[PDB]
Each structure stands twice: as structure tokens, then as C-alpha cells.
Amino acid sequence: MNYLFKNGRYMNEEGKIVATDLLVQDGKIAKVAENITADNAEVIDVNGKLIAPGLVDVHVHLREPGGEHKETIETGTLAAAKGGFTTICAMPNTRPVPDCREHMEDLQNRIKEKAHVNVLPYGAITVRQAGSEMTDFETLKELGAFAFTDDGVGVQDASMMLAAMKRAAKLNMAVVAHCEENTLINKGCVHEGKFSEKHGLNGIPSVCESVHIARDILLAEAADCHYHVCHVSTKGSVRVIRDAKRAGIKVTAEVTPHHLVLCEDDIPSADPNFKMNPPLRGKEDHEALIEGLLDGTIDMIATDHAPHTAEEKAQGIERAPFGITGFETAFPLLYTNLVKKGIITLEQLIQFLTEKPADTFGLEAGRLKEGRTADITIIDLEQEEEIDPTTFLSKGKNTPFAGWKCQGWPVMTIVGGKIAWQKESA
């Protein structure tokens, strides 16, 4: 192959947007500079649009194998590419769960078979995520497992978490966690606050999350293991982590797009498209997440793509499941209400979805360096458009942003030099 994008905008190594061109030879960034003269490659003028490295989503739910109806590896991967992602990481909460050799192989096959984008599989912590027996971290490690977690549910037994961190630490890997203390769930369907108080609905207190994060941080320090927190959502959660990094403990965390733009006060009514775990909490918590993202307490942004079908979200929020699709929303949504809003610079948004996510886990990605795989995404910052689940490539159309008008939409994604997705008029 041999491409060469002309007249575009990109972020240099100093973290500043400067107009340049980009050459692609043999699925690898051949040359990055201005007026890259290469009279031997098909020209693709981006007319000043944004040229950036493929987005890195470290928290996704492809559903396959298990509920291939909610989503599929090829469909979920296609939408992902539409959102600009070139590397995603599927969670192990699928049935069967990647808790052994045979399962990790069967999953690793479906990927290299029907997956339009890079898919690093998450290794489970306990078999069938029952949390009573630890899996063979060595095997999964060999079978190219990204990291270990029981996402969807939390590791209730403390001694299991300590053991898991010791072993993971030896294998030089991370333990990702869905922090949630069951005895505190109070079987809520939203956040325990103003909203749950007005609609007479059970709410989930913040402590249900913060308590586990606090516990894991000590275990992590005791095992000297890289600990990463999933979708932070409370003021106390950010604090506990901030005190942690201040002590020099290897801890990292992420925050979802919806937890950065919406809080409880934004839920119009008992609408299932606003129900997810963790839920949208107070504005006090919202401000905390934003403050944590700006001071370093929060290391990266992850969508936590949780696709579902309308038939399921159809029933009351109490019966309805937790989860919101986010692949095709992520960037445009964040560029309009965050960057364009002033909260953060364009340079930071990109980093929070490319180099920062990659470094936290040691991945040769999220960077437009010469010699690296050609994982690129072209973005139109000018054109304004409304979010319409009708046009989503993902089977999951469960989104609360239906109608919202944004900018910064991915128009073309390149996975390994090969185009994985194109808009339809660029």
C-alpha cells in the first residue's frame, strides 16, 4: 500500500496543533511533515481536517460470545472504527468467560477472524467470575491477555484480591477493577440522591464504589502491583486516588464520557437510556470527576461501551439493564461539551484517548510516530451534526444523547494502513 494525506492538522510532540501532511508506506507511518512530496502514493486531501492517531478504548463490551444479539465482534468493532478507535479492549463478562485456555483461544480466534479493529482481550480474575477461585494468570498471560478483571461485578473477597495482585505483579501486569461492594448496592437502579428521592426509587450510594477503591489501593501497595480503577464516579473516589498517587502508589483510573457531561440533575425522568453502572451522581460528584481529570488524578477516558436492545431497555428502568453505547458518541460528544466548552484543550482530549491510555498499559500505540503501525483517524471539527441512533453501526442504540448536536466527527479510520471505515462524502 501507499497513501499520503495532504493539508491536515495534527498534534506535534510538544502538544500543539500544527498543520502538516502524513505519508503511509506498508501499513506504517512512513513520514510525518509538511508538504511531504511523494509522487508515488494515492493522494487523499483532508482539506484541513483533524489528523490523529487511532483512538484507544481500554474498556469495551462486545457481548460475543454470549449475547450475540446485543452486539457482535464485527458489528461492535465496525461502530468502534466509526468512532475513530483503532484499538479497543473487550471485557471478560461474556458467556463463556475467558477464564481458561480453551476459552481464551476461541475468543482470540473470533477476533483475528471477524474484527475490523485491534481487540486486546481482558483476562478474567476468577473462573466464571464467580469470585471463589482464581484463574491461571500464567496461561492467559501467554495467550496474549491484556489485563485481569471481573468487570461487571466486583471482587468481594479481599484475600482473593490480594492474591490476584501478588500474582499479577509477578507477571508484570495490571489488575483492573469494577469497584462495587454488594452489601451496599441497596438494589438501586440509579444514584441514591435527589433523583431517586423524587421518583421513589432505590438509589446506589457512593460508598458502594469508594469503599472498594480504598481497599484495593492498600492491597495494591501491599503487593506492589499496578492497580487501575474502572469508571470513577464519586467525589470520594477521586480523593482516595489523589491521596494514593501522592504517596507514590502505582494506581491509575478512568472516567466515562457520560460521567463527564451528565450528572443526576440531567435525567428528565425514569428513562432506561440514563441507567448504567455506575450511575450518574450528584453535581458535586460531577465537578469532582472534572477536577480529577484536570489535575491528573484521572489518567484517561474510556467509553465502557455497554450495548443493549430496545426491547430490553423498553421495560421500566427498575427492570431494565445497565449500559449505554458510546463508541460513536465518545469524541464528537466530548469535543463539543468539553473542548468547545472550554473545560479542556483539544490537545488534552486527544491524549486522554491515545498516548495516555497506551502508556498506562505499555502499548506501542496512540502516537503518530514514524515506524509505527498506521492506526489513524480523520476528524471533521467544523461540520455540525445531531446524534441519531438510527444511523448507528452498533446494534446498541441505547443512548441518552439522541438529538444532541456536536462537531468533531470521525470520517475515516485506518487500521494497519487499511481503511476500516469511511463516512460517505469526504
Cite the active site residues. Answer: 304
Cα-based distances in Å from 206 to 26, 117, 197: 50, 35, 15
Of 200, 247, 269, 390, the one binding its own copies by CB under 8 A: 247
- The residue among 116 and 178 lying less far from its own copies, judged by its C-beta, is 178
Residues 6+ apart with CB under 8 A from 109: none
Distance (Å, whole) CA 169 – CA 178: 19
62 labelled binding-site residue: yes
Beta bridge partners of 380: 409
Examine residue 304 and tell whether it contacts Zn ion (CB under 5 A).
Answer: yes
Examine residue 76 and tell whether it contacts its own copies (CB under 8 A).
Answer: no
Residue owning grid cell 469535543? 335
Amino acid occupying residue 407:
Q
Report which of 312, 401, 402, 391 is spatially closest to residue 67, judged by C-alpha positions: 312
Using CB under 5 A, which residues numbered 21 to 40 contact Zn ion? none
Applying CB under 8 A, the span of 8-16, 133-141, 180-188, 291-299 interacting with its own copies comes to 180-188
Residues 246, 252, 254: CA angle, nearest 5 degrees: 125
Using CB under 8 A, which residues numbered 143 to 172 contact its own copies? 157-160, 162
308 labelled binding-site residue: yes
For the CA atoms of 77, 83, 84, 86, what is the dihedral angle to 10 degrees? -20
DSSP 319-366: TS------TTTHHHHHIIIIITTTSS-HHHHHHTTTHHHHHTTT-S-S
Min dist. Cβ of residue 167 to its own copies (A): 15
Min dist. Cβ of residue 227 to its own copies (A): 13
Q: Are 377 and 84 in contact (CB under 8 A)?
A: yes
Examine residue 296 and tell whether it contacts its own copies (CB under 8 A).
Answer: no
Examine residue 209 and tell whether it contacts Zn ion (CB under 5 A).
Answer: no
List the single partner that 158 binds among Zn ion, its own copies, none, CB under 5 to 8 Å by kind.
Answer: its own copies
Of 6, 63, 116, 178, the one binding Zn ion by CB under 5 A: 178
Return the residue nearest Zn ion (CB atom): 178
Examine residue 151 and tell whether it contacts Zn ion (CB under 5 A).
Answer: yes
Size of the site for Zn ion (CB under 5 A): 4
Min dist. Cβ of residue 419 to Zn ion (A): 29
Of 211, 260, 349, 379, the one binding its own copies by CB under 8 A: 211
Distance (Å, whole) CA 262 – CA 333: 11
The annotated binding site for Zn(2+) is made up of: 59, 61, 151, 178, 231, 304
In the complex, which residues of this chain contact Zn ion (CB under 5 A)? 151, 178, 230, 304
